[PDB]
Structures are given as C-alpha cells and as structure tokens.
Amino acid sequence: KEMPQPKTFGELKNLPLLNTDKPVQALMKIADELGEIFKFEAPGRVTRYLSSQRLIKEACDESRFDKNLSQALKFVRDFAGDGLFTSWTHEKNWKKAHNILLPSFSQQAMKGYHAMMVDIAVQLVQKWERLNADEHIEVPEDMTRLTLDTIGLCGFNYRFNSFYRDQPHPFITSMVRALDEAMNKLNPDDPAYDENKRQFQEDIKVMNDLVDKIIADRKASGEQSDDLLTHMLNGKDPETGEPLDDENIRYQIITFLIAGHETTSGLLSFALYFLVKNPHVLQKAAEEAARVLVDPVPSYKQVKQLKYVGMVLNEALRLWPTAPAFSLYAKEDTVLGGEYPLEKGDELMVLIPQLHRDKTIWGDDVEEFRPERFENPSAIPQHAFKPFGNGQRACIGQQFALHEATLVLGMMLKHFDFEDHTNYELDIKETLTLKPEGFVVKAKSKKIPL
Numbered sequence: 001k002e003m004p005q006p007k008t009f010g011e012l013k014n015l016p017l018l019n020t021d022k023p024v025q026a027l028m029k030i031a032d033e034l035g036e037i038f039k040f041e042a043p044g045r046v047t048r049y050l051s052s053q054r055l056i057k058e059a060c061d062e063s064r065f066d067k068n069l070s071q072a073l074k075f076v077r078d079f080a081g082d083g084l085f086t087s088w089t090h091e092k093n094w095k096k097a098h099n100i101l102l103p104s105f106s107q108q109a110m111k112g113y114h115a116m117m118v119d120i121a122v123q124l125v126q127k128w129e130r131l132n133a134d135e136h137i138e139v140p141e142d143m144t145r146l147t148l149d150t151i152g153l154c155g156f157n158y159r160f161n162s163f164y165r166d167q168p169h170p171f172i173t174s175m176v177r178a179l180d181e182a183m184n185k186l187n188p189d190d191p192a193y194d195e196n197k198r199q200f201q202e203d204i205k206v207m208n209d210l211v212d213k214i215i216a217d218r219k220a221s222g223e224q225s226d227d228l229l230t231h232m233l234n235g236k237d238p239e240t241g242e243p244l245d246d247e248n249i250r251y252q253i254i255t256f257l258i259a260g261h262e263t264t265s266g267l268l269s270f271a272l273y274f275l276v277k278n279p280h281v282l283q284k285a286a287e288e289a290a291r292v293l294v295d296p297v298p299s300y301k302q303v304k305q306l307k308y309v310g311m312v313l314n315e316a317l318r319l320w321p322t323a324p325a326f327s328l329y330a331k332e333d334t335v336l337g338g339e340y341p342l343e344k345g346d347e348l349m350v351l352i353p354q355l356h357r358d359k360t361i362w363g364d365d366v367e368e369f370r371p372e373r374f375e376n377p378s379a380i381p382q383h384a385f386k387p388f389g390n391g392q393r394a395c396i397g398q399q400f401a402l403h404e405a406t407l408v409l410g411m412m413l414k415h416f417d418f419e420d421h422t423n424y425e426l427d428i429k430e431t432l433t434l435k436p437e438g439f440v441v442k443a444k445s446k447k448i449p450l
C-alpha cells in the first residue's frame, strides 16, 4: 500500500501544516485524519508517524528497529555526551553504563532512595503549609523544584536547595538554559547567534565543573552514600570487566537530571490537573492516601500500597505521556505491517499520546480520565501503553519516577485539599517534554503534622 501522507505544497512538502510551537498536538490531529501511519516530509527530511498498537508492536521488535537519535537528542548530546539517553545502542559506554546501572534503578533499589525522596517531599509539603491565606501554588514550577532536588540528592548526594531560592542554583540555571538552547536550535552560523554559542559553552562549563568536582571530592573521601554516584564509582560491567570512567560518570549525572526532571514534574502536574477536574477520582485517591499513610512520613512499604494513586498516575501518563515521542530506525530493509516497505535507515516516530488513544485497545471513551482502566495492569496488551519507551532503550528511571510520583502525590493528598481557583484551561507547552503551562491551584491544609 502507498503510505498515507498529508497534503504537500511543492518544495515545502508538509511543513506548512506544522507552523506551531505545539507540533505533537498538531500531529495528533493529523493522525485523527489519516490513521495509524502517515509519512511527514519537510525540506531535506522525512519520517513516518505511528499511532496504533498493531504497528508500534512491530516497530518495537529490536531485531528490526533500534533507537534513533532525533535532531533534538543530537543537540542535547552536546552537553549530555555519551550518557545513556543520548548514546547510540552500539556505543561502548551505552552498553557498559546500561549493565552497571540497571541494578541501581530496580524496584528493590528504590528502598535505598526512599529516605532522600521523603526529605525533599517534606520540604514541598512544608512550603505549602507555610503559605499565607490567599497565596497560590505554581504547580509545574514547584514540581520541578522537587524533582531536580530529588534527582540531585539521590543522584550525587548534592543539595540544590531549590526551596530556599528565587533564582535556582547556578547548575540548574545553566542546565535549563542549555536545554532551552538545544531545543531552540531545532542560519545558526549567523553572527546574531554568537551570544547563544558563547552562553551555551559557558553553561556546559558550569555543568561539567560542578559535577567533575563532586566526583573528585567523593573519590578522595571514600565516603559511601546511598546515591547513584557511589554505585557508579564501585560498579564494574560484567561483560568488559571495566568501570565507567569519570567523564562518563559526569555525563550520566547530567543525563539523569535532563531525562528525569521535567518528565516527572510534568506527570505530577498532569495528575493533579486531572484530579482537580475529576472530583470523584480525587476523593477516592485522597481516601486511599489517608487510609494507607498512617505514619508521620511514608514508609517504602506504604508507598507500595498506594494502588489507586498508582492508577491515577498511569492514567495521566496515558493521556499526556510527558516524553511524548521517540524515534527508531530500520536496521535493514523490511516491510512494516505487511503493507509498507521501508529501507535501511528509514526513520519511524512513535506518537505516544496517539497510541494511548487507540480505540481498538482502549474503547471508545479515550479522552475520559478513568484510573480504573489500570485496575489490572497485566491485562493491558503489551505495547499498548508505552510512556517509558521500549525494550533495552526504555527509560531506566521508570521505577524511580513512579516511586517519586506516588510518594509525592500521596503526601499531597494526605496533607491538603486542592482548589482549581482559576478554572484553569489546559494549555500544554511542548519542549523535550509536555507540561500544563500556567497550572495553578490553592491548597488548604488539613493540619496533619509531619
């Protein structure tokens, strides 16, 4: 079959159809019109967007397709290096870091990070407890302070102290500005970008200098902490027998922050958005939080018992997966779905929000927020629900992100009632990630001490 494709406009190809800063949302609308697969061409480039479980399951066959570095990832690689997120599968440091780090990101490993996640979560709760009457909360902004600080503390035992500041720690300022410049890069040698380049280089140096110093401090003290840095200093890859070198360790630390901060904060923000818009679900979730979180701060075991909170989070990931697209290439010539010939090197994009709206899997009501879809997670067909990507190149942080989010949302629901005081209109900003831009609430404390 010929591959469906939107209208082309001479040499502009399909580009005039994507004149937006919200391309994923625009591509979803194109998928609504054209279906499970369409080609999209712009001057000098081509990809193919997939949106059905049936085709995405095939695309997820690692014998036929592997992770591609999109142009976004190639620009991020300028400061994330050969960390896990921005490496090709074949790179020696991908394989070594993957093997070394997997055990440190397992569900069992979460027991070791729990206390430090609670430390930052308590700081968030106390911030909100201390607001004066009529003050409000900037949701994504506070969730991002939380996730940055949690990844810093669990990643390398470093306190960014984001809840002490108006202006973030200089590392955060540089990382956020570097990521913003990478995304904005999507005539770059024009002199008017001279300042962009100088600033980018300056931000790289700030990031490398801090992380390289802590790595050095840690090797000097011999201190063993409950952080990922300790695991990386001590770990050996079973296959090569080699540890990660100090440069790659730095890139992994930078990577954890980049890959984890806004995905996780976006999830918490969308979950709270859906809860304030669905009062009955909010009540059920808050009832569970009150029933289960019976101690002054949560234990690891208690977080594991927040079943319905976990369902809420999965249903937020279903509707607005916060890293909404990933790229694949064809390893060899092949035919996709019995119908679409592909050449070696051809790119595919998995459009995750549209996958998560495949009516053939989810039924007719796909826009409804219904956590009960996830009552029995094992009943969901493989490759229908993919907010954390695919296979060996899936999110290594998944258990971390979900432990964090379940703990934090549980505490939020234990400690406060929330008000959508502005009747907030969902406005989804797209960068590397998705967030509900401008989402604000008021919280009324239940006055339960920590």
Ligand code: HEM
Pocket: 067, 084, 085, 086, 098, 151, 255, 256, 257, 259, 260, 261, 263, 264, 267, 321, 322, 323, 326, 327, 387, 388, 389, 390, 392, 393, 394, 395, 396, 397, 398, 400, 401, 402
């Ligand atoms: C809800 C939160 C998160 C979501 C939705 C998410 C999603 C994803 C997705 C879709 C990928 C695959 C990207 C691709 O194929 O190009 C990925 C990869 C990755 N993520 Fe996450 N992420 C989240 C949180 C985290 C956190 C908290 C960390 C670190 C602590 C993290 C670290 C990574 C790393 C290192 C990779 C690359 C893995 C590899 O290729 O070996 N992520 N993530």
